Design a protein around this ligand. Sequence first.
Ligand SMILES: [Mg+2]
Length: 49
Amino acid sequence: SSRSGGLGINLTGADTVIFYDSDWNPAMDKQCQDRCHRIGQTRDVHIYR
DNA sequence: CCCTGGAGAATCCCGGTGCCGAGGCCGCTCAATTGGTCGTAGACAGCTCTAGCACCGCTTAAACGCACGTACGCGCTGTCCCCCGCGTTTTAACCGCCAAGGGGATTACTCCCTAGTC
Ligand SMILES: [Mg+2]
């Protein structure tokens, strides 16, 4: 869920982010899309919307 | 047979800080006092009248003892069934998020209402 899990979370294993739906303001979108590539992402993170 | 040391847990209780509202203070304010009237209704007899206090002697109708007797409230036995304490799950309000009107005030342009003198 874009709210319960959209805030600070340390997922690193996945290298791809999928945005099934958009949520108005882009702040939450950027918070969601940065839950994978934060520090330990050793591979390029691909984001699809 | 039944009593309890220990333990689990609910109670009583006063620190101990934050809050919102009980009470005080301020500014109107309207209704109880008070002058009178004038006439209304109840206190004061008064005549009346009407039901009750006590009395008399009966009359068996109820009231009470005695004896039989007998069955039911209560206390004994047993089982059984069903509701509670606890553990797990799901409705149930409440508070945040967003983009759009509604509108109420709020101020800007302006435009007619107002009023002066060569
Ligand atoms: Mg953080």
